[PDB]
């Protein structure tokens, strides 16, 4: 008994979407969530829920929904699945192997790819240990290998952790930008706050 629409237009229709290592999080609560509205927007070529039954989802209440958003490449969308190796599922954004949520990834090469490359999306490349479930590495320190100390320079054995995606419109499907929004549903023992139309 809430009778209020959730602000899904703030995580699916935002001007500045997110970064890879600085993925945005907008927790939703105390509102009615009708996921069918997602079928009227741009064609979502990737809608793979993991334990959520995407079809007939309006008839399901949720306790705490966490909507995370970021932008990745094309061949790296398959790493947002719960449990996978690679480069962004180990040092940028990793999901637990209990993820009862939905990953919606849509191609954004129409507005997130400019001439000579869009360098406004950075992804982490060098990190000591693998990223733990739901950890955001907002820090950027010079990755000094544990052999010889380094300083604020760049050389043969000393480099920078973050890299720069080059989203050019002359790239085929796989290197084009893709906006990915993951909805994590708690569904634990607690009074629910987000339900559907019923």
């Amino acid at each position, epitope marked *: 008994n809430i009778t209020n629409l959730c602000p899904f237009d703030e995580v699916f229709n935002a*001007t*500045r979407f997110a970064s890879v290592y600085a993925w945005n999080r907008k927790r939703i609560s105390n509102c009615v969530a009708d996921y069918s509205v997602l079928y009227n927007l741009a064609p979502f070529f990737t809608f793979k829920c993991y334990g959520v039954s995407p079809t007939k989802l309006n008839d399901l209440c949720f306790t705490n929904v966490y909507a995370d958003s970021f932008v990745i490449r094309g061949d790296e969308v398959r790493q947002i699945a719960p449990g996978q190796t690679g480069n962004i599922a180990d040092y940028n954004y990793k999901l637990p192997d209990d993820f009862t949520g939905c990953v919606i990834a849509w191609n954004s*090469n*129409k*507005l*997130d*790819s*400019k*001439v*000579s490359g869009n360098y*406004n999306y950075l992804y982490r490349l060098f990190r000591k240990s693998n990223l733990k479930p739901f950890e955001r590495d907002i820090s950027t320190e010079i990755y000094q290998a544990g052999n010889k100390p380094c300083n604020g320079v760049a050389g043969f054995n000393c480099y920078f952790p973050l890299r720069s995606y080059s989203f*050019r*419109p*002359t*790239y*085929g*499907v796989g290197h084009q930008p893709y906006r990915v929004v993951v909805l994590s549903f708690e569904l634990l023992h607690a009074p629910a706050t987000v339900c559907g139309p019923k």
Partner: antibody
Amino acid sequence: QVTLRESGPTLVKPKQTLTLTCTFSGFSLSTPGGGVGWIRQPPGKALEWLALIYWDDDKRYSPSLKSSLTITKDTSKNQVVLTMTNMDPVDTATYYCARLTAADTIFDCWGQGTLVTVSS
Amino acid sequence: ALTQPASVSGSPGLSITISCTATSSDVGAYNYVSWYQQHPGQAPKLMIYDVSKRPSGVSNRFSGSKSANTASLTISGLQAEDEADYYCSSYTTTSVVFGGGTKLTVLG
């Protein structure tokens, strides 16, 4: 209702700097994916892209000309300014400013173009 | 760059095609390509953006195709008010190429 009107002096002395301005009305340049560029068209020749600006102050230029082309935005008054130095008697052409709505729609709406001549 | 046929003739009503070959293929996947029309004395007007798409205000007489790496503008049902210069433009790895020109001569 997109309207892109060019301005600036048509005649320019050789070896100087142009001040070709483009007033755009009917859209906001802050839209994600938008942008205003410039296309040169010599009399009796083909089109050639010169410069381009985006919604995040990103300035792209032609790889052949990067030491003279300078584009800037003045969204406070909706006026994109383009300045190029070292005007040679080969740049006499009809300059256009077209809006780049998105990456898929390359320069959909064009202006009217101004004939800039370089003669002593 | 992009090469186009210089002169193209067409009888009133028949269908013609304009080839946009990407010689020196640094164009990449060649995903986006837009065809503009320019009458003598006016500004280039976009006839058809990406090969399967049509802007509001253009009739179904214009269509686009791309067999393997060559864009083709199919114009069917020619009229007297169609003799204009057509330009195909795509994206390169570092610039925005605009190709050459193509003059349509509707005899009669």
